[model samples]
Target: MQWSGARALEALLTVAGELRGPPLQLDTGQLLKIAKRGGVTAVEAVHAWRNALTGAPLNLTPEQVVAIASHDGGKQALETVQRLLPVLCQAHGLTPQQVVAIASHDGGKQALETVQRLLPVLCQAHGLTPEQVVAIASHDGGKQALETVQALLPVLCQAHGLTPEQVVAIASNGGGKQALETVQRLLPVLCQAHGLTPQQVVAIASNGGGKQALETVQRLLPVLCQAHGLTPQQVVAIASQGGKQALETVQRLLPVLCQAHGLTPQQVVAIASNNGGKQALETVQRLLPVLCQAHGLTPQQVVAIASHDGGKQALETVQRLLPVLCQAHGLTPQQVVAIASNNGGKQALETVQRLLPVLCQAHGLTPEQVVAIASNGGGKQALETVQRLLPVLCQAHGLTPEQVVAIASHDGGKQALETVQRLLPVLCQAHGLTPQQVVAIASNGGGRPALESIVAQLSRPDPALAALTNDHLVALACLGGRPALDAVKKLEH
Candidate 1:
């Protein structure tokens, strides 16, 4: 029996046709050699070799074809790669070589499909770009990680306030999928209860142990805030000092600092007010008592230094500056404490100390009065409101300077004075009240509430107050609290 070379070549061409691969350039001798060396079936050997040539020109030796076709589902895997290689390259913006490299692995075909299905889902549903999809899918965890992101990304962005950029960052790291899911579950509670902004939520979620760190803060923030009698904003100010992980550190150490170390919440907030404040808090938690006992500083004085923007450095500098402020400027410890107790107080003291003589001489304010105005929760902002609005309040509203001073002396007095400046004209026009009467109500402690109540009444008056007298209106102002508006609304009958 003799074999015919022509007939063997015809059969090989028929097998290549059946596979529908790029046309083979090999002679019968080379085809028989590839089949023998590859140990692959005729379809697998021809399909792999033909598709390999469809990419950049290359020799598909028998061993190379065998490697490509030797996977668990060799027949289907080669077919998937042949059909989808260029499609994956175009869709993923990957080079053909890169596609080949990824598809060369066992289970690579299924992994490719997972990536393909999830890439568009992430882009369309979660706003990830094509490049970001490539970055996430290229990781070692590959399709499993990509699928995890697809399932969790939408929830993280829509419900938890994470932006796509942030989600992409999270997914780029190992365990990011878990982090995202944890943050999604915890973020709403943290934001609603702690007043965390979206940016802060990102900061929290991106920390080490991502979700665990966030959960740590969620568990500790309220307890720390209540235990120390801190306002939510103050708690935010403190947590945000360090990045999200630092916030967890803060939560863990805050109680230890306060309870074991005898520091107060106000002092902790002051320490945590600046960038790196978490580190500062950690340092000061140990040193606060030393500063108070050894340096002849008061607890409030230590807090004054901690709350400045320089964090630890500012606290350190205050030890020296406090004495100079007292000795050279003749300001007392109490005066310095008063000036530095609120937000931006460190800078406020520097400005106030430099300008004190002028402030007193020009504004006719005593040192104590200056201290009184600054020491309230307003600190620098209160001081700013006073300097900017004092003349306007006095001249436009016929208020004496002392009356203006009185207005800036409360917890939010400076802000209230500023509010009075804005609303006084509106009240006089809309409610038929004079500027002096408005100033009078404002000066007596019910300015904003009274203005708000009057506006509410005029905008939607009760039938009884439709005939409400000016005397009755002034009585409403004198009713003296936010609740008074509701009280007068009831008086309509």
Candidate 2:
């Protein structure tokens, strides 16, 4: 909204792109030259000329521009002139016809007349047709201003040598969304004026969504349905998918198909399920034999257990009859691996989106762990596996031999020593500490020989014990039940 004189020049060039061009070329240079001579700013003159061409030109002089710029005064002047035509026409006792004529004369005299009467003469002088003028007018008025413009429609059509129907059709939706119904009402008139066939009219009105399609109102739904080759199920599904608010979407679509083609829900379901349901059923049936052979379960037994939603008892029965089931299903071990591991079931994929976050929290999984699970298990089980393994990996990383020796020799705790024994390799890899160093640190067995051999070397426990005790006790008090505090307190001095 902050307009510089420079940006105004740019706007002039941008708006001028749509003008009459070449040979008798009109350019910014000509405009700037006119303004320079007359001592007016370029924008004011251009705006005046634009208004003139659009049948609403202001009569501002060049000197006025300098005056306005100097005094910051053109704001009220511009608005006053803009609303002058419309407001004056209303104030005067003139009809719309007289008002337009007065406007047609550039405020020469107020009169009431059709814009059609005003346009041809106006065009001869200005080189702009009534159509263009009305187009310009409609911009300010939006849709409501159309009735005022109604008189110009025929004039524009005649000027362009188009039939009246074409003009009506062009002007029909001057209103907007509320005008769709208006367009529908005016269709017969438009079709008549423009030579549009009934089929073409229906096509123009049909906006794809069932509600948008006025075909039902026109009793052309059946014809339209036939044209689109819509089935009840495709109709329902498309309708449902079109809007995510599912039931409402389906309801909106359902009635259209039902009213048009008399499609039943059964038919709708058939159309919806045909491709997917058959493929899934056939796939399960064909793979059942091979899978059972590999896993050692019969197709019937598998089906029976699956039908019961497979509790622990059912799984045990299948496991017990594994050999027979494998032969019956004709599945190889590789196929069993794919079945058990790769494509566990489609539901597994859906479950991961729902449950992976909770699983990650319980299992101490980082983003890296989640990614590993996603890559390995390909879905929920992968996620669950990562969740389960993460804590173990972290624990493994913490259980160094030095930690064990410190605990066992100083504190005589067995679990710390055992944990160290259990995770020596893990600690070494995690910390990049050596196995020999780990053994020297944590081989704190209370057995007499090793203990005595170690004890023989030391003169006396150092002052470091008091310092260590103060540090451990202070940390324990501050941290309040921290793992480090408990571990340090248990350590023997």
**Ten residues in a row with the worst lDDT in model 2?**
105-114
How far residue 279's Cα lies from its native spot in candidate 1, in Å, is 3.8
Decoy 1 TM-score against native: 0.46
Per-residue lDDT of candidate 1, residues 296-406 (tens digit): 776666766666555465455455467777777677776676665555556666666665676588778887777776665555566677788877777876667767767
TM-score of every candidate relative to the true structure: 0.46, 0.18
Deviating ranges (above 4 Å) for candidate 2: 1-83, 86-162, 175-493
- The numbered model that scores best in TM-score is 1
For every model shown, the clashing-pair count is 1, 26
* Model 1, runs deviating above 4 Å: 1-180, 185-212, 215-277, 283-290, 293-295, 299-317, 411-414, 425-437, 440-453, 459-493
The sequence of per-residue lDDT tens digits that candidate 2 reaches over residues 1-493 is 3445665656665544533242124455654443344334333533544434234343433333223222122233233334554544444323333323223211121111223344444345545454444443322122232343343544444443444443334333323232234334546653565344544443343222323323222343232246545453343332222211222323344455456534454443332222222232223333444546534545434333322211122233334434542354333433322222222223233334344456546643343333323321223443443334334534654433223223333222233244444545643664344544444443332322222222222224333354453333333323332343335435665
